[PDB]
Design a binder for this molecule. Structure first.
Ligand SMILES: Nc1ncnc2c1ncn2[C@@H]1O[C@H](COP(=O)(O)OP(=O)(O)O)[C@@H](O)[C@H]1O
Ligand SMILES: Nc1ncnc2c1ncn2[C@@H]1O[C@H](COP(=O)(O)OP(=O)(O)O)[C@@H](O)[C@H]1O
Ligand SMILES: Nc1ncnc2c1ncn2[C@@H]1O[C@H](COP(=O)(O)OP(=O)(O)O)[C@@H](O)[C@H]1O
Ligand SMILES: Nc1ncnc2c1ncn2[C@@H]1O[C@H](COP(=O)(O)OP(=O)(O)O)[C@@H](O)[C@H]1O
Lengths: 574, 91, 203, 102, 86, 83
């Protein structure tokens, strides 16, 4: 009473479990016991493991195979062979009338002449598709009569959304299968997982693994990788480190630096950001800021103090890290401070989720923010801000021109400031926990000694919008008077950037501070913001490159100095 | 009366949550009365009070923590010794 | 036997066979063989032009010539479109004239949703088939069912099931298991409890 | 709010004792009163006392259902309309966990 | 190996076999013959392919190579299973 | 060439803005398509001499964001249409 075909096309977990070739199974005791409890029934023994990819469903199947041989089952499963199978391997051919149904009939005929096979199907949400879609002899329409009478015994393994989508075929498929929810393990659970089988990858790679190594593996896989679960991520980082260390040994100990190195190579943040700033990024974040940001030093030290206060603090993790509103004119540095801190908080930022609330002018415009109802226009994706954060829920949100919101949105804002994690989507609850909500404010420029401006702007907020609203917001970062010498300073910074760019193109330009001063005076007016300066320096540099390359007056490789010696830009190339 | 009561309750909850970090903290009743003194029922209640306890107590402890004065296992009280928030830090 | 899923269509057909053996059936129905004609086991080995309908021709000729044979078909809605190929003479058409003339003596079991989906709108074959609907037993009929069925579950779990427990299982299943149907969901409760108790007795 | 608390407790013990009306819900309440009195904190208190995570509380914010056509977000949109398949932001939420606090 | 056609993906496998002949490869991957598959030269093709799988079981040092892997996995009938076993 | 860009919307506008920043658009597969030697010429009517020389920037900075203007290579404006 043996099974030729089923053994030919389905791996026998029991057989390779005899040989101790199977890796250990750690934890999951409650889940495996529940699996056995379901398998012990008489009519529908089939459990369907519902979780997320990479959580350890197949690990639970392996553990069950283990406990079978290791005399752990309650003698109703004693000597029963677990066989993993995949329908994809079964089908293998569709251009012919009945080949597939023939394979599956053979398989059923072997399950008959046996009692010890419990066929573990991975991703049985694909058990309904084969052959005709929903009106012909698919796989399910021939499994169901056997499944309902205990003829066949099974262990399915789906994903939650696949269960929800492909148990709309309820009638048979649901009642034939009992769900067993398996959830992804926590940090500590996963650390113990790893400590279970460190002596497997150690023996495979002949490399030594430390405990802080796997701690960093788990912490890193959580912080810097998403769209992948545990213990998958962890064991994968560990094994990648094992292989890479083995190679480096040729042309014997994995440590946290290697874990950082593999995570960096995966996601793209540099290694210096991951490892060394792990608890000192807040220690030098003010240095990072005052490097990237020039001016408004009082504002930047206020922000630094607030973020390190919330950072090395006991604040409720649930609600968002920082709620700051910048009062000031435009062009004073609102975005630069944001990008700088984000680059210092979430290293290598590219993360400021900017939203212009002046675009969400009116009442119904808030549906553009959250999304349309189901039976209405533009509902499928929608959710500008909601989908934006749902994508990467680890960043810094900047909301431009908070004033221009109709009062309809301030409600959503205060809900967010009420512990975040707002459910403002088509059934999606987005979480704003590690984020930082920042709001570009109104003019507020007229009020801008220190205490005077302060009381003024507080009253302007009283008159402007709710006191309760700012009672929600943490800090009021005031963007003081426009730049006077910081003008020339930011000219210098941009020109340093542009000189680097011009140098890597095999040139060298050095503009003296007199020309910098002239560009400063021209570019930005006293009333106007400091933004056109970008354009001003662009036009001057494009003119000089245009003329000098067109005229040919200059030769490549000769340093280029600009001055205002004649009252105009004079270029002395030599 | 219920307002001072809920000051007491919020302080208790706050210490409860701070026990996550193994920090030992106490609030004198004088601090509780002073904290409630800002909250008034004239307009509305228990919103300004919660924000006030959060701000004063937690931010002040964070200030005296990043200044390095206290570590875990120490005993701390925020007291009003002169009519305004101050830290006694019985340690 | 159009009805909801967990109601016992297949159970009804089996009850018919059991009545056949017990001799309770009428004389005209006495000594007939109920067969479970699966389509998966029929359309299997063809992969050619003239083999599926060949098997069905031979099956029909046997049935016509064989005196006493009833044919029970689970998931009747698979007759339509069975032998789907270039040849495209599916089982539903090979049987149609013989079904209507009355020689082939079928017993179809389907699911009401499958009935309305693609045997009601898409067939015009709900002519050769009398739709005798089957629906949930009452709260009391389910009790009688399950209590009549209690011996097998005793045997399997090797425990003893107190009848108050059966009453309670049915009454609770009625209140809040809304998605499923009786006696299926009641039996599920009894069965899982038996498994839990046996497993407790083990450890 | 001894009155509110005892009312809620009576409701939950009616439910948990074998006496509640099997037809209609465990209990229905309308919590009137000024802003900030704690009439939302009672809901969290109740879910915590009756469940664990206290996030089993299914919460709807009727400040967003003002446009009077969003009612097609509680129950799904009709058949031939967008968002018919994933319908019931409220209905499915409650279908999942039937022992919960709305 | 994912890439556009003609970018030299198979060239990478070739240079790999080269570095295999040399010592650049570490020891675990030492003694590894890289081969390919002629679907043409191999009712009976299943027999020959299963024989190939027997020889794969014989010596566990035969790193195989597959071009156009999608249209290959027919052979999947015993390759995809043999992948799972290892 | 993009004609009637004014008829666009802030989302497709941000799309073409980050394009004009690097040309790298990624649609339907994340395809990192390169804009190596392409030309980006946008066409519209905000005008509809010196007074026009001013009103053009007026309705540009007034019709959409100034950063997209600041990704200028050159702006070609012809007012007179009859001669
Ligand atoms: N408790 C555990 N015991 C053994 N392996 C585990 C455990 N938890 C996670 N894993 C590892 O996670 C990986 C993926 O788990 P698996 O169940 O195969 O994912 P999926 O659920 O998509 O099949 C496996 O390699 C497995 O070794
Ligand atoms: N404090 C500062 N340090 C460095 N650069 C600054 C500072 N303030 C403004 N800038 C310059 O201003 C420009 C940012 O303009 P932008 O942020 O768009 O203005 P706004 O925030 O009003 O929209 C950047 O080029 C930046 O170099
Ligand atoms: N009696 C109370 N016990 C505990 N917390 C309370 C109490 N009264 C008010 N609160 C606090 O006040 C807020 C409750 O006010 P809430 O009912 O939400 O007001 P509204 O919904 O009208 O804005 C929460 O922050 C809550 O913790
Ligand atoms: N890095 C390289 N060094 C040397 N030759 C290369 C390199 N990349 C590609 N080639 C050449 O490409 C040709 C074949 O490319 P091939 O790998 O067959 O393309 P594909 O990957 O699409 O099959 C070979 O002649 C090979 O020498």
């Amino acid at each position: 009473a043996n099974t030729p075909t089923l053994d030919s096309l389905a791996r026998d977990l029991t057989a390779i479990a005899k040989e101790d070739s199977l890796d250990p199974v750690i934890g999951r005791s409650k889940e495996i016991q529940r699996v056995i409890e379901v398998l012990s029934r008489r009519t529908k023994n089939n459990p369907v493991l519902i979780g997320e990819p990479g959580v350890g469903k197949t690990a639970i199947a392996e553990g069950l195979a283990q406990q079978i041989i290791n005399n752990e089952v309650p003698e109703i499963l004693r000597d029963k062979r677990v066989m993993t199978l995949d329908m994809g391997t079964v089908v293998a051919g569709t251009k012919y009338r009945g080949e597939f149904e023939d394979r599956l009939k053979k398989v059923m005929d072997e399950i008959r002449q046996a009692g010890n096979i419990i066929l573990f199907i991975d991703a049985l949400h694909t058990l309904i598709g084969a052959g005709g879609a929903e009106g012909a002899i698919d796989a399910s329409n021939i499994l169901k009569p056997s499944l309902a009478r205990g003829e066949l015994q099974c262990i399915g393994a789906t994903t939650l959304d696949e269960y929800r989508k492909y148990i709309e075929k309820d009638a048979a498929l649901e009642r034939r299968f009992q769900p067993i929810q398996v959830d992804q393990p926590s940090v500590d659970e996963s650390i113990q997982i790893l400590q279970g089988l460190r002596d497997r990858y150690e023996a495979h790679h002949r490399v030594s693994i430390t405990d802080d190594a796997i701690e960093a593996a788990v912490k890193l896989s959580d912080r810097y990788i998403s769209d992948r679960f545990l213990p998958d991520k962890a064991i994968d980082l560990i094994d990648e480190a094992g292989s890479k260390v083995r190679l480096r040994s040729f042309t014997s100990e994995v440590t946290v630096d290697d874990i950082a190195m593999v995570v960096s190579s995966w996601t793209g943040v540099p290694v210096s950001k991951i490892a060394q700033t792990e608890t000192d990024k807040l220690l030098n974040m003010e240095n990072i800021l005052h490097s990237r940001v020039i001016g408004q030093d009082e504002a930047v030290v206020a922000v630094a103090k607030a973020v390190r206060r919330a950072r090395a603090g006991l604040k409720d993790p649930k609600r968002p890290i920082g709620s700051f509103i910048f009062l000031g004119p435009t062009g004073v540095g609102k975005t630069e401070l944001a990008r700088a801190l984000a680059e210092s908080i979430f290293g290598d930022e590219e993360s400021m989720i900017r939203i212009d609330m002046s675009e969400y002018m009116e009442k119904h415009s808030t549906s553009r923010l959250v999304g349309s109802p189901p039976g209405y226009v533009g509902y499928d994706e929608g959710g500008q801000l909601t989908e934006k954060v749902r994508r990467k829920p680890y960043s810094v949100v900047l909301l431009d021109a908070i004033e221009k919101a109709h009062p309809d949105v301030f409600n959503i804002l205060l809900q967010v400031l009420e512990d975040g994690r707002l459910t403002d989507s088509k059934g999606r609850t987005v979480d704003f926990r590690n984020t930082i909500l920042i709001m570009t404010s109104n003019v507020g420029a007229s009020e801008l000694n220190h205490k005077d401006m302060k009381d003024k702007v507080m009253g302007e907020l009283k008159r402007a919008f709710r006191p309760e609203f700012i009672n929600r917001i943490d800090e009021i970062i005031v963007f003081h008077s426009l730049e006077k010498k910081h003008l020339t300073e930011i000219v210098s910074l941009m020109s340093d950037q542009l000189t680097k760019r011009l140098k890597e193109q095999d040139l060298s330009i050095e503009l003296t501070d007199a020309a910098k001063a002239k560009v400063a005076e021209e570019g930005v007016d006293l009333e106007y913001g400091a933004r056109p300066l970008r354009r001003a320096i662009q036009k001057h540099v494009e003119d000089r490159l245009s003329e000098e390359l067109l005229r040919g007056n200059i030769h490549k490789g000769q340093h280029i100095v600009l001055d205002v010696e004649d009252g105009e830009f004079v270029v002395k190339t030599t | 009366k219920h307002l001072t009561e809920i000051v007491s309750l919020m302080s208790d909850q706050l210490t409860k949550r701070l026990k996550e970090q193994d920090l030992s903290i106490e609030l004198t009743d004088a601090a509780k009365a002073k904290v409630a003194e800002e909250g008034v029922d004239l307009e509305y209640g228990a919103r300004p009070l919660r924000r006030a306890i959060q701000k004063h107590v937690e931010d002040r402890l964070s200030e005296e923590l990043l200044r390095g004065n206290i570590h875990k296992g120490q005993h701390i009280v925020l007291d009003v010794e002169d009519g305004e928030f101050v830290v006694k830090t019985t340690a």
